Design a protein around this ligand. Sequence first.
Ligand SMILES: CCCCCCCCCCC(CCCCCCCCCC)(CO[C@H]1O[C@@H](CO)[C@H](O[C@@H]2O[C@@H](CO)[C@H](O)[C@@H](O)[C@@H]2O)[C@@H](O)[C@@H]1O)CO[C@H]1O[C@@H](CO)[C@H](O[C@@H]2O[C@@H](CO)[C@H](O)[C@@H](O)[C@@H]2O)[C@@H](O)[C@H]1O
Ligand SMILES: CCCCCCCCCCC(CCCCCCCCCC)(CO[C@H]1O[C@@H](CO)[C@H](O[C@@H]2O[C@@H](CO)[C@H](O)[C@@H](O)[C@@H]2O)[C@@H](O)[C@@H]1O)CO[C@H]1O[C@@H](CO)[C@H](O[C@@H]2O[C@@H](CO)[C@H](O)[C@@H](O)[C@@H]2O)[C@@H](O)[C@H]1O
Ligand SMILES: CCCCCCCCCCC(CCCCCCCCCC)(CO[C@H]1O[C@@H](CO)[C@H](O[C@@H]2O[C@@H](CO)[C@H](O)[C@@H](O)[C@@H]2O)[C@@H](O)[C@@H]1O)CO[C@H]1O[C@@H](CO)[C@H](O[C@@H]2O[C@@H](CO)[C@H](O)[C@@H](O)[C@@H]2O)[C@@H](O)[C@H]1O
Ligand SMILES: CCCCCCCCCCC(CCCCCCCCCC)(CO[C@H]1O[C@@H](CO)[C@H](O[C@@H]2O[C@@H](CO)[C@H](O)[C@@H](O)[C@@H]2O)[C@@H](O)[C@@H]1O)CO[C@H]1O[C@@H](CO)[C@H](O[C@@H]2O[C@@H](CO)[C@H](O)[C@@H](O)[C@@H]2O)[C@@H](O)[C@H]1O
Ligand SMILES: CCCCCCCCCCC(CCCCCCCCCC)(CO[C@H]1O[C@@H](CO)[C@H](O[C@@H]2O[C@@H](CO)[C@H](O)[C@@H](O)[C@@H]2O)[C@@H](O)[C@@H]1O)CO[C@H]1O[C@@H](CO)[C@H](O[C@@H]2O[C@@H](CO)[C@H](O)[C@@H](O)[C@@H]2O)[C@@H](O)[C@H]1O
Ligand SMILES: CCCCCCCCCCC(CCCCCCCCCC)(CO[C@H]1O[C@@H](CO)[C@H](O[C@@H]2O[C@@H](CO)[C@H](O)[C@@H](O)[C@@H]2O)[C@@H](O)[C@@H]1O)CO[C@H]1O[C@@H](CO)[C@H](O[C@@H]2O[C@@H](CO)[C@H](O)[C@@H](O)[C@@H]2O)[C@@H](O)[C@H]1O
Lengths: 536, 536, 536
Amino acid sequence: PWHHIENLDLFFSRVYNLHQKNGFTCMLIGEIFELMQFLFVVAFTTFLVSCVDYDILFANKVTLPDAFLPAQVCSARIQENGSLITILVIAGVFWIHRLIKFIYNICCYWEIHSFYLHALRIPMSALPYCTWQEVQARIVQTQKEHQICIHKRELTELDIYHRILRFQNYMVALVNKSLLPLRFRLPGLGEAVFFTRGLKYNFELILFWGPGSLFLNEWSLKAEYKRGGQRLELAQRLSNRILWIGIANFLLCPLILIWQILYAFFSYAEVLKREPGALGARCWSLYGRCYLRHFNELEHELQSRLNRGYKPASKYMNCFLSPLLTLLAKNGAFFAGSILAVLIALTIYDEDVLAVEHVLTTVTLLGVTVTVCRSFIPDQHMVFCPEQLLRVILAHIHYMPDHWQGNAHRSQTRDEFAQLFQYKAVFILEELLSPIVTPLILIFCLRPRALEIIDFFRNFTVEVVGVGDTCSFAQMDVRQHGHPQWLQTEASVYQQAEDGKTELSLMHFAITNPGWQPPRESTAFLGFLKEQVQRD
Amino acid sequence: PWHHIENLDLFFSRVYNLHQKNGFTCMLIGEIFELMQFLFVVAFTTFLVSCVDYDILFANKVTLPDAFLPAQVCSARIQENGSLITILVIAGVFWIHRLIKFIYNICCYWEIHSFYLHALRIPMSALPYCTWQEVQARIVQTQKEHQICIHKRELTELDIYHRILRFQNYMVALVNKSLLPLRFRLPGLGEAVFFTRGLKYNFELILFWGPGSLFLNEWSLKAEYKRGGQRLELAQRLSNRILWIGIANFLLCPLILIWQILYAFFSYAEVLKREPGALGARCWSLYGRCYLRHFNELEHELQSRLNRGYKPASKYMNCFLSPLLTLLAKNGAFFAGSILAVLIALTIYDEDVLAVEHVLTTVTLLGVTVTVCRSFIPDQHMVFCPEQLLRVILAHIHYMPDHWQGNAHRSQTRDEFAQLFQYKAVFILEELLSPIVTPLILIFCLRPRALEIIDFFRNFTVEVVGVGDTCSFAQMDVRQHGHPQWLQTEASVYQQAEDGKTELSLMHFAITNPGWQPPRESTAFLGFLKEQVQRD
Amino acid sequence: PWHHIENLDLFFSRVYNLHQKNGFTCMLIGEIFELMQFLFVVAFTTFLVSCVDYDILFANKVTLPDAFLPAQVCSARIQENGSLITILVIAGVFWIHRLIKFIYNICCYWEIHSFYLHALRIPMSALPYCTWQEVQARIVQTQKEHQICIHKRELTELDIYHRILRFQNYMVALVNKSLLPLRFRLPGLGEAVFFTRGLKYNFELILFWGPGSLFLNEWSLKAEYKRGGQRLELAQRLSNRILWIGIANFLLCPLILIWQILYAFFSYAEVLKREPGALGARCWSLYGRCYLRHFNELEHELQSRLNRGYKPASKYMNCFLSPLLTLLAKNGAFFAGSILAVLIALTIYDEDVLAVEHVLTTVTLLGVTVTVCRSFIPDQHMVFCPEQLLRVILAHIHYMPDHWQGNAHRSQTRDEFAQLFQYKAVFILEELLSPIVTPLILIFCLRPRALEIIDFFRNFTVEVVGVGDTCSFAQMDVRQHGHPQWLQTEASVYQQAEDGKTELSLMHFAITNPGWQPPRESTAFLGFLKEQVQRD
Ligand SMILES: CCCCCCCCCCC(CCCCCCCCCC)(CO[C@H]1O[C@@H](CO)[C@H](O[C@@H]2O[C@@H](CO)[C@H](O)[C@@H](O)[C@@H]2O)[C@@H](O)[C@@H]1O)CO[C@H]1O[C@@H](CO)[C@H](O[C@@H]2O[C@@H](CO)[C@H](O)[C@@H](O)[C@@H]2O)[C@@H](O)[C@H]1O
Ligand SMILES: CCCCCCCCCCC(CCCCCCCCCC)(CO[C@H]1O[C@@H](CO)[C@H](O[C@@H]2O[C@@H](CO)[C@H](O)[C@@H](O)[C@@H]2O)[C@@H](O)[C@@H]1O)CO[C@H]1O[C@@H](CO)[C@H](O[C@@H]2O[C@@H](CO)[C@H](O)[C@@H](O)[C@@H]2O)[C@@H](O)[C@H]1O
Ligand SMILES: CCCCCCCCCCC(CCCCCCCCCC)(CO[C@H]1O[C@@H](CO)[C@H](O[C@@H]2O[C@@H](CO)[C@H](O)[C@@H](O)[C@@H]2O)[C@@H](O)[C@@H]1O)CO[C@H]1O[C@@H](CO)[C@H](O[C@@H]2O[C@@H](CO)[C@H](O)[C@@H](O)[C@@H]2O)[C@@H](O)[C@H]1O
Ligand SMILES: CCCCCCCCCCC(CCCCCCCCCC)(CO[C@H]1O[C@@H](CO)[C@H](O[C@@H]2O[C@@H](CO)[C@H](O)[C@@H](O)[C@@H]2O)[C@@H](O)[C@@H]1O)CO[C@H]1O[C@@H](CO)[C@H](O[C@@H]2O[C@@H](CO)[C@H](O)[C@@H](O)[C@@H]2O)[C@@H](O)[C@H]1O
Ligand SMILES: CCCCCCCCCCC(CCCCCCCCCC)(CO[C@H]1O[C@@H](CO)[C@H](O[C@@H]2O[C@@H](CO)[C@H](O)[C@@H](O)[C@@H]2O)[C@@H](O)[C@@H]1O)CO[C@H]1O[C@@H](CO)[C@H](O[C@@H]2O[C@@H](CO)[C@H](O)[C@@H](O)[C@@H]2O)[C@@H](O)[C@H]1O
Ligand SMILES: CCCCCCCCCCC(CCCCCCCCCC)(CO[C@H]1O[C@@H](CO)[C@H](O[C@@H]2O[C@@H](CO)[C@H](O)[C@@H](O)[C@@H]2O)[C@@H](O)[C@@H]1O)CO[C@H]1O[C@@H](CO)[C@H](O[C@@H]2O[C@@H](CO)[C@H](O)[C@@H](O)[C@@H]2O)[C@@H](O)[C@H]1O
């Protein structure tokens, strides 16, 4: 609760994170569990590889520990493996770095916990039931007593938003203006979108937080990037920086590939054996979390919007069925159910139809076949309405390409709605492929864009008095960043928010935070909008 | 895409069918699968009857093909069966007729495929996502360039409807005016309705397409039926025709009975072993598909209406529970679950309670008993609302007897809503009974109505300039076929659409096809209706 | 259908009960089943205790009846048990009393059956589909012909309500004004509510129907309780009466405890073995059936309101999840699914991984663990809205504390909504604990309130001309029993309906029974309410 604290972006971010992971104790436990999962994957894997005698386990009454070798021998058997010892040393160094960051993080989170209890007065018991809106209103009222925000002003409830979301507004504006290569033209497929967790991590490590990034403070852009001249040498320097970060990625490829595979296998294989159709359900697509996101939108508001609108979207995606697969399913079900009905009537009649060379395996395989086909057979009496489903999905989601509203029922619309909605299986596949795909996209597809990235960060970076250097769009300025088709805008092409992000983002903010005082242009815009809504 | 083609009814029907079975390839495959199902049922059955040595299979390690007899012996064993060889010869003749019709059909469908691609310009890829409305608008715009409709006029979008649905409007009007015996008074039951697939096939074979039917062209009624005189000799001729068609049915009874038995056995026996309650779900009742159908309503519009309104109807049917069966279920569940809980506690305690003469079979039978009873026990906390359920079911369905709206909750209403909604099990039973029941209804209950059928076809058959001879009701003429209670109508009794079919059918058509230009009386009617709706 | 019958409260109650248990036959069967369940529990239990030779059954091919001992020995083995014979004699005396009451009840119900058939003219076939509203309208029209209601007036449709619900309105008003101890302050828990079936039975046996109750006739209060004086001696007499009834409860404690144990064991043990999560579903809480109930509300109207509003309430209760349990579930699922995926991959690879000392039991236990955790893991994409859920729950339920409407999302609101909504498991536990808890609450917590109970029954008991002595609140008088905050009321504190029961109860009655003629003040109140609703 200190006066003139430190970097305020971090303080506010930590406060927000403490509200999200409901309380200090919960958060501490969550982090500890996160550290134990890594160590368990690595140690379980190295135990399975190195200490277990599979031959005795398989064939050659045997108790479980009859397989395991004694530690006095496991240590020697794992030590005489240069590749394994090297992977373990790199894994242990990453782990120790993560454990040290965790200790430092909890030592800094006890300070936020004391902030809550003593200056906000929200006990950790009343924190899960507490409405981040109420939390930040407490903070804004506290700004008087326990002084913060070194010496600029009183907090204005959007400052906190800018502090928590400075780099995320930059990502939103980068992806919104089609920098940052995502679309690819694969042979044998349409234009794929490849945006993963590792790729966005690399983009942020290149642009925002690193040794030689664009930013020096975490709230101020380096002084040269604001200068119009010397843009070409800056572009060359950025290109070399991203080249070498891509090469580090290419060299770390084997280790991250191993991690993604062990790890994929340690959860999704269980789910596969249980319910193989859980991976046929669809998830909201990291590209799509960044596309459908308003500018100053905290994570919980985006996710509330995203799951309010999830079941409409599943009803839409299941409308759409291929006739050929449906017919193949129907008829395979007929023929398999016929042979199975005959074999079942026989095994019921005499009961010795069973234990005939292949009858039992045949019954089981035929049952699996009938079940798969019946899962592919659409439910008769299914209401097919892709227009109203798309209308309600939009009402929850707020952003959609413009060539969707008319032709809701075509393959073009369905095909690029799957850009946003994504079978979970292609998610797991796409997270597996990112170790081997991220370096080459990073080296080849982004380095040509470095001169456009430099011009973005020079052109769209405003200095706001209290917060520092923020994105130019996240101001929610209807002027200078509007879009003439949605709407007064003093914005030409290249200087405009594409899918209506400025207008819809300002509306979403004004609706979610009713306490905020809207500037002149924003107030006039919202008033004219309300007049048009109530009039028309 | 030819000029002055052929019979246009067939051309249009084929075009519509090609749109429905989404594309030529899909349709071809579907027909091939339809041909392979027949051949598989017959060949699998004759293999099970004739080639398999059940004794060795049952009792007397044995591989599966140890049962089968060698073909050099299967041929002789199937050939020395006069009944089997005769059934196989009749089956093979029906098959060859169906295969020849299939070859002719695909040779005629390649012409419709070329029509699409070259004159409509809708590739087979864009056809599943294509909206029959858009397809027929293409057709109506094409009528200028690739000339069709030999020489009468330009197409008016209702001509295509009449062409595709000429005989189906006749069936709708026949069933609507209570010709065509459907209601029967069985002893021990209420008035049953027996309308099947085979019965309607026989009605159409008698009336519409045959050697000596009412129609000579497929678009023109024979010349004598338009004459008022000689009605009695025509009635006698029709009565003799239907007598001999009924006798052909009675003679073919054994073969169609065998077909229905086998074919139901295969599929529904599999479903029975899987989920015996799937046959307790209810389907929309061939009588009911013809009762709830508007006049000029293509199959996909009826089915869209029928499944939009399916779940309300299931919620209605499950409201209604017999108290005696509910009480018997509750108490049988109590006593069975009590004995099973005791036996389960014992088998858990010692684990040797099992392998006691009858304990395991008792546990299994008691589990089945508890599950059946719990399925019959209504869900407590079930909202019982048969008035609003009937209101929404009507909103989807549009046609309901008039003595339903008040007493939605009685046994009279539920009992004759099951005329339309029909357990799937009574559907399979009613399709099994049709081989043995259709000849006797056809000989006894319809031959007395022949003089009324002749008067129907003489009185209600208009000659419309472009289309030929169509039903008089399907014109959707508010005059001369109205109903005074629904509504100006110059229609007395016997000359009126009963359940409001004219008014509601004209409204449904005007709503589904917004491009159609409504005649004077229809326009005035729809305008007055809109004024009354917006006023009241 | 007799003229000047008997006590009319009983006649009307019986008529209502006959309508509820749909018909005489159904009702008779239900009662017979109720008698057979008691006898079966007792006889099955005494057979399991006394006649079965568990040693031979467990260890020492054996047919089931090899366990049972011959009756010539079972009689002697059950007779030489003083405790068992005593429990059986008390059980048989209670049974014989119940059988005698059943015979008398059906001999009195044949009279109501003849009443229906001959004076109301509703056959038992048309009775399940018959709408108690229609039944009582028949009754009110019958009041002219088959004369009833000895000589006061014609029936006014609220008289029947008072007759059926005289003592239940008293319970509603007792619980509504916080007499009748329900809230308790347990250590280690919040303020528990303990209101069971046995406790309310004891309250009614003390107050309403007994040897020396408050009422002498069933429709008239004893003459002394109307007198202001002698209140202290009446309070002492009531205190002694409730002391001795509590002591009878304390002495009968072992037998009712045995009954509850057995009876819960049978049914809920079966359900436990089947679906252990059925006991995690929530039920509407005997306290809560009495709290949410309007004054003159028959049982079926309350239950219709209670299940119309059940699924909203379950959606509310499940949008509250503890973060710590959710995190523990997620991570236990991870670690268990990881070890199980490894063991499953091994058993798939070689198939002899199985039959290794503990692998199969480990796979089963791990599967149970993963399933339990996945049940505790909240469904991602779950819409969390406790404000609109509470709004719709209120719309169905009509009564709620006033400090709920604002903070729908807190632990205070959830914690005292579980007062009304109650896991089924705590219901079964709370019905088990009532034999041992009811005597001590009855002796200690209610005897101090006897002087307030006397003042309640003296102050709030009006003599209405046709019905006799009814509760003062159940008149639905907006004056003299209103509440100034809801609303003209001439009611001070202690003389007012707390949660708005008078106003909302009068509204519910006027809406459910549209035929009733509302008195002056009630009519003016309802009119002003309608004017305010349509105005604001
Ligand atoms: C110049 C060099 C550049 C090279 C850079 C490489 C970039 C890619 C590296 C990827 C990696 C390196 C680890 C490799 C280990 C090697 C050891 C050898 C192993 C041999 C045996 C770190 O990278 C992750 O780090 C995260 C931050 O830690 C980032 O998100 C930040 O996180 C927060 C901040 O605390 C804030 O929310 C915010 O700041 C960011 O959102 C991620 O964006 C990033 O992918 C892997 O860590 C990852 O593990 C995966 C599960 O595989 C985790 O999955 C997630 O959570 C699971 C449930 O828990 C679910 O299962 C899974 O569905 C879910 O998705 C990831 O979350 C991540 O933890
Ligand atoms: C040739 C030079 C190369 C040297 C190594 C650098 C390699 C490049 C990355 C280095 C990297 C991890 C390694 C990447 C993971 C690899 C995955 C696979 C690897 C194994 C397969 C270590 O990060 C720091 O580690 C420090 C030591 O631990 C180093 O000491 C330095 O010197 C000392 C004195 O001068 C200083 O006192 C000391 O403070 C310095 O830090 C630093 O050099 C380094 O920057 C960066 O990761 C991390 O960056 C941070 C922001 O920084 C990210 O911030 C998160 O999100 C932001 C929200 O907006 C906010 O930032 C923040 O709210 C949030 O927490 C994290 O999400 C996190 O991901
Ligand atoms: C003077 C003499 C009069 C005698 C007339 C008899 C009238 C009754 C005969 C009935 C029969 C004779 C076959 C007997 C074989 C004997 C061989 C011996 C066997 C010994 C071993 C033909 O009759 C059917 O023919 C159809 C046309 O082919 C008709 O519909 C037309 O169809 C289209 C046009 O192509 C157009 O849509 C339109 O024009 C009509 O809608 C049907 O109405 C008619 O029932 C049987 O065929 C039938 O098989 C059944 C499944 O049993 C099929 O079931 C349907 O599809 C299944 C999924 O695929 C499902 O399982 C099933 O749920 C579903 O219901 C039927 O569809 C039908 O194919
Ligand atoms: C004592 C005389 C008796 C002779 C036999 C006739 C027996 C009566 C029916 C004969 C029957 C099948 C047999 C019934 C099935 C039996 C089931 C059980 C049987 C085994 C247990 C064969 O139909 C034709 O077969 C031809 C040869 O294959 C014959 O050759 C003739 O002579 C040549 C030169 O003069 C000519 O060139 C040749 O074109 C002639 O056809 C014809 O006689 C016969 O009409 C009719 O079935 C079929 O009728 C057609 C419309 O016709 C129905 O149309 C469908 O729906 C309509 C949509 O609106 C439209 O029509 C159409 O869009 C659609 O496709 C079909 O749904 C279909 O069902
Ligand atoms: C001075 C002395 C005072 C002492 C008073 C004690 C007060 C508590 C006694 C409790 C007891 C004494 C029996 C003990 C047997 C001892 C024999 C020895 C056994 C050794 C081996 C009678 O008490 C019950 O009697 C009922 C009336 O009969 C009362 O409700 C009235 O009922 C109607 C009127 O007919 C009218 O609706 C109305 O008037 C009241 O609503 C109940 O409120 C009362 O609890 C037990 O009876 C009970 O059995 C339980 C199931 O355990 C029954 O459960 C219910 O139905 C089940 C499905 O059927 C379900 O499973 C269960 O979920 C459900 O809850 C109860 O319903 C009840 O029948
Ligand atoms: C030291 C004296 C003690 C003597 C014994 C009395 C003990 C106290 C209760 C006695 C009790 C059962 C015992 C309690 C259960 C115990 C559970 C565990 C026990 C074993 C562990 C027997 O009830 C009666 O039984 C009679 C004989 O069978 C007795 O004969 C008497 O003398 C004769 C000539 O003068 C008379 O002709 C004869 O008519 C007298 O009845 C009476 O004394 C007794 O009142 C009362 O239970 C019952 O009360 C009735 C209303 O009364 C309740 O009414 C129900 O709900 C009401 C709706 O608003 C309405 O009333 C009604 O619509 C409905 O039906 C019932 O729900 C029911 O529960």
